[PDB]
């Protein structure tokens, strides 16, 4: 078992906002992404406007202070650190992507669901239906659902 959060009550804060999207749409996408995971675990997520949060959400480009530089438009879209103090848990989104609420560019919600999975301690799945599959694909946001494998995975960590 890799690292897990030692509590079910987990805080997050959005450090900064991509200019690609309306600020309220970023808030909404991130909120719903956390909700996807809270819906299948005992985890509860609380948004922090100011102060110390377990999970910091950052938009940045290229080399941005963590020895894992982003790569311009395309390729890697985002990355996240597993549960832990400091940078542990934090989710970073490559500002060189074009973030959207829809099928165009890269959908922030779907990407955030995947990254938050990492923030909670999940690794990848080989199931092409799993949100934790390694490569992004757009899927109909309304019909979006975690796969049985995603659920097995996260319930193995928290219950
Ligand atoms: C352009 C696009 N790029 C990608 O997908 C790239 C490769 N992947 C990455 O950018 C990953 C980040 C990433 C993956 C996803 C994703 C995956 C699957 C689905 C999905 C799939 C099927 C069904 C359903 Cl319902 C959903 C949705 C989103 N969203 O973000 C990077 P990472 O966080 O894994 C990472 C970074 C650094 C290290 Br070190 C380790 C891990 C592509 N090639 O398709
Ligand atoms: Ca990139
Ligand atoms: Ca952190
Ligand atoms: Ca951008
Ligand atoms: Zn980073
Ligand atoms: Zn991943």
Distance CA(109)–CA(100), nearest Å, equals: 8
Q: Which residue has the tokens 């897990």?
A: 4
Probe residue for ligand 1, chosen from 32, 37, 134 as the CB with the greatest number of ligand atoms within 8 Å: 134
Nearest alpha carbon, ligand 1 atom 30? 111
Distance CA(78)–CA(85), nearest Å, equals: 20
- Identify the CA nearest to 15 among candidates 95, 123, 132, 97: 95
Q: Which of 115, 116, 120, 150 is catalytic?
A: 115
Could you tell me the domains of the chain?
1-159 (3.40.390.10)
Contacts within 8 Å (CB) and 24+ apart, 144-148: 144/36, 144/109, 144/110, 144/113, 146/36, 146/40
Distance CA(30)–CA(115), nearest Å, equals: 10
Instruction: Check the annotation: does 74 bind a ligand.
Output: yes
Q: Please tell me whether residue 129 adopts helix, strand or coil conformation.
A: coil
Q: Are strands 99-100 and 78-80 parallel, antiparallel or unpaired?
A: unpaired
What are residue 13's DSSP bridge partners? 56
Ligand 1 lined by 137 (C-beta under 6 Å): yes
Distance CA(118)–CA(69), nearest Å, equals: 18
End-to-end CA gap in the chain: 14
Q: What's this structure's resolution in Å? A: 1.5
Q: Work out the number of other CB atoms within 10 angstroms of the CB of residue 84.
A: 14
């Amino acid at each position: 078992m890799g690292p897990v959060w030692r509590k079910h009550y987990i805080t997050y804060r959005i450090n900064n906002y991509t200019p690609d999207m309306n600020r309220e749409d970023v808030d909404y996408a991130i909120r719903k992404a956390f909700q996807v995971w809270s819906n299948v675990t005992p985890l509860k997520f609380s948004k922090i406007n100011t102060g110390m949060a377990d999970i910091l959400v950052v938009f940045a480009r290229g080399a941005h202070g963590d020895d894992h530089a982003f790569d311009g438009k395309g390729g890697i879209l985002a990355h996240a650190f597993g549960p832990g103090s400091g940078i542990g848990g934090d989710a970073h989104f490559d500002e060189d992507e074009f973030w959207t609420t829809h099928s165009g560019g890269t959908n922030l919600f779907l990407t955030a669901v995947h990254e938050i999975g990492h923030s909670l301690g999940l690794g990848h799945s080989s199931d092409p239906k799993a949100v934790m599959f390694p490569t992004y694909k757009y899927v109909d946001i309304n019909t979006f659902r975690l796969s049985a494998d995603d659920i097995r995975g996260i319930q193995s960590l928290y219950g």
